[PDB]
Amino acid sequence: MFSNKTRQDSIQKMQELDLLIIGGGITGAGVAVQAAASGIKTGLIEMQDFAEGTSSRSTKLVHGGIRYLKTFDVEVVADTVGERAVVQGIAPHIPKPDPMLLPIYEDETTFNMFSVKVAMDLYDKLANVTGTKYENYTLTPEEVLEREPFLKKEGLKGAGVYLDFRNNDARLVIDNIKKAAEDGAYLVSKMKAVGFLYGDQIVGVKARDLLTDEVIEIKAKLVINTSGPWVDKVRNLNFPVSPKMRPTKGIHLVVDAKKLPVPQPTYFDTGKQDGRMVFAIPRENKTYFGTTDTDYQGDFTDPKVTQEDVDYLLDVINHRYPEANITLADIEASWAGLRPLLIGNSGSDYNGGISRGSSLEREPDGLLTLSGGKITDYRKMAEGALRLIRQLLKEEYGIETKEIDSKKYQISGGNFDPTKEDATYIADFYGTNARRIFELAAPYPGLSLAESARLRYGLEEEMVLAPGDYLIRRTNHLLFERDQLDEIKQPVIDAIAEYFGWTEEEKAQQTKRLEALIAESDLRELKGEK
Amino acid sequence: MFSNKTRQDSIQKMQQEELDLLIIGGGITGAGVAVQAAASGIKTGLIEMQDFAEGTSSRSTKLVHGGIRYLKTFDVEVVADTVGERAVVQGIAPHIPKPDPMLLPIYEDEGATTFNMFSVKVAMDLYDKLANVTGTKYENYTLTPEEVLEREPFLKKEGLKGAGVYLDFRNNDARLVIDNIKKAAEDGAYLVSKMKAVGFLYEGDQIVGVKARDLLTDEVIEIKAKLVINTSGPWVDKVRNLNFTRPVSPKMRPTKGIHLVVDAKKLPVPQPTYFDTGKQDGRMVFAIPRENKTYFGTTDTDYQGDFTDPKVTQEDVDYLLDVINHRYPEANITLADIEASWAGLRPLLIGNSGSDYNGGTISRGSSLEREPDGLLTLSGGKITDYRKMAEGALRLIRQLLKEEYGIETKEIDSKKYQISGGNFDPTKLEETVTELAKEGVAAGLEEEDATYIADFYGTNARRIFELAKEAPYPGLSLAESARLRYGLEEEMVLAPGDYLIRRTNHLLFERDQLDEIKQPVIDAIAEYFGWTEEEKAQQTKRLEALIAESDLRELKG
Ligand SMILES: Cc1cc2nc3c(=O)[nH]c(=O)nc-3n(C[C@H](O)[C@H](O)[C@H](O)COP(=O)(O)OP(=O)(O)OC[C@H]3O[C@@H](n4cnc5c(N)ncnc54)[C@H](O)[C@@H]3O)c2cc1C
């Protein structure tokens, strides 16, 4: 059990914990996955749902960064392919091998047909891939147009193909939390930290239950802040400090596969003389692409896509594919996110052109803060967190904290061997936990057999409190299967209403929430009503 | 024989019947062209204003550098091209460019460096791979600070973090030109030194020959030829301007560079060393061992003035001494410690730099072009690409001889045509030197000298060994005498400096022993040519001037 039941118990049990963690993203989720495995009594709190922050709004990939070889920044490339190795090892059901395609042009560079080849050999050598079935290779201008029919011809010299990975971020967070649960940790989502319990120090926190206006006080030896782009907002809860962050907005658009077919990931130049590059990626029967870099000020819980972000991106896909003719009217889904950057770094520092871009400082009040960084280095940042924690529990309290190896502790649903039609999907999506799903496959009105269990499983096991957490973060219904959402939408909500036995007004408020969300995704407010 | 006598017969033939190809300039670029034309059957002539190599081909860095710096901006094709042609040159002249691994120390207090301990490793591995060197006896390796000071205890310690060691070659530029020249002569080419082109001959607006002046006798002759190719290095514009019937746009813009020599006890470096100037100007300086000395440079300044005898300025010297005194803090080197030196002009095409050499169509930085009047010009390039430059030129030459006159020519593989003294298995230099040295010992020479001469002359050591067997000149050792006699009869020595400066390492690298042999060498050449007493006194005054300039006597006041 891991639902609203397990939830209420947790809240009560936290009524002096060893460690309190603020933030339920990939960062907070990684700290706990390790602390629990090491003994510490831990109690984490996530203001909204799990992973509903930036950790569900990224490019959704694990790019190697081959681009860095242009300035011979070889140590950065080695770290990256190296850490990417661990993760794939501790979560064999999430990041998957999805070789990428990099076309070469003499009209417009970065590499030529001769240099891409040597760049890809140094890449596989550092990645220790050199030899396996995923070894790089090149393509002739003829054999490139085959795979991608609408790809610009004027000036095509061919292309290169090297290893890269697909990675659902939301699932990475949840299966880390679900493993943190199994190890006894008070994980409470939908609970917001609103104040601090103080002489001059910090001994506790005062949280609010967003499900019930009840205010509780928490007691713990140490309080660590891992609120991502919210790092400063959480800090300022202590009424004198200065800013440490400066986030940027990036967005993505989505279209039907037949409006822009691409059998594999494709990286290329914008063509607007700004040095930026763009992706066009496949994902089920769709193809999404992007992204975007712009200073942002306003609401952090729901950043919005505008006309100018659309203009910019359309001008890019239309130049790289002159035969597509894509307009605002072709987009079926979308999303926006904010990058947790420290004053000084930029968005291009993610792929070229304590951890790289992150820090772990301790405030004078005694608050630990882990900021910046990037999802691909989540496990690595937490190991550096558990260090200033296993030492801080002794030099001040004398607790015998254990020692582990995060690089080898496999998480939820993925404990099998690394080199491991709707039961096929279920296996390759939940991995191991697909076993528990089958046992449950007593359907529901308007739904299907399989779709019933994946919903029941969410409620029983994935802390599904609201319907949106299911169609958005626990599965790919809203973002990649829009054209199938309207014949499962109402049914799903009623099974939720049933399981929770909400009420005729709690049910009304919920549905109201799905309306606002789906609409902002489908940019109805821009289309002057679709 | 290849001497003043051969010279005089060549001068008559070039006047008897028309040539198919006449070459202007006897440095590495013309020597290169001459060898490939001769081997192909093309009747060939070549004229050189001074001695062979007296221009910029005897004034370079005397190294064959790989260009590992180019990996910093991932310019891999340039590096592949360079290590690849270096292997090709070693195959045709295994007795000149030799292996001599480079030491590259790493520092953290310098601010903005090229590589760090982590990055030099992946750079040296990529370097060896591109050069098919990984898996051989010269594959790279790194050193720790304490390992570095073990080899050079006098290197700046503040910040030293270790070193990288990778493969590179030492190269004698003057000996490389003359062994290409000797090969061309053996294959029939008419080669004349101390002969200057002073004008063109015409039939309409079309060049059909050259008027040449014999600098030794004030005589002026006419040479008829089907094609004329200009390979005069930094003098490329000045030669093109011998056509006064048409002013023309300049292609060149030469820069100057110098090199200084001190005795090794003053800067003991066991192997070549490469480092930052410390003047944050983006440049690098070398410290290299040669015989029992250490030489260092170089500089890079815009120039105007006489092209035949460029001079070292006090400003060139202070720039270099500031670099060495910063890199080795206890050595304290000043002008008084310098015993020899040289300066030359880079043949750059308007728009290029000395920097592009080491990462500071035909080949990088060169061009092959024909003028409206029929004159062909081959300009730019660098010494390490000489054979590749001659190949592109021969390609156009055969195509013009067939089309315009119906003349078929044999196609040779220049990548395998070994030059003078280099006819032996390139992978077995030491075995070949061990054997030849025996033939030398059985001739009356000592162990040290026979090995030297075999390593320096290669196969040609046998002729040196034969003459040795047969008559020491007054004041000279059996060994020295045999080298000089070989010089006069087989290497076209015509004046004292040709021998002490370019055929041997006497002036530059053994200055401390030059006085013992200076006069005996002039006397032997004097009697051998049978000079008037007035002629000898002038050949003497001229050599003294060359020594005064190397010694930096004026600056020293
Ligand atoms: C456009 C874009 C592209 C990206 N591309 C890459 C990439 O290519 N490679 C890469 O490695 N990374 C990439 N990233 C970055 C990566 O997604 C983030 O670094 C990562 O998701 C940050 O995780 P986090 O847990 O620190 O922050 P979040 O995921 O935002 O989690 C922090 C949580 O704190 C919670 N919180 C805030 N205040 C409170 C409070 N008062 N009480 C309780 N909880 C609170 C919030 O609800 C939030 O869920 C990209 C990001 C963006 C925006």
Ligand SMILES: Cc1cc2nc3c(=O)[nH]c(=O)nc-3n(C[C@H](O)[C@H](O)[C@H](O)COP(=O)(O)OP(=O)(O)OC[C@H]3O[C@@H](n4cnc5c(N)ncnc54)[C@H](O)[C@@H]3O)c2cc1C
């Ligand atoms: C300081 C310095 C550093 C350098 N660094 C490098 C390096 O690291 N790597 C590299 O590969 N290269 C390097 N170079 C360049 C290399 O030395 C030259 O490219 C090469 O020697 C030039 O060949 P060249 O034969 O074209 O000219 P040259 O040797 O100059 O010869 C041209 C010849 O034609 C003759 N001539 C002129 N006019 C007439 C006439 N009217 N009649 C008859 N003959 C005439 C001249 O007397 C001369 O002998 C460097 C040069 C310098 C000076």
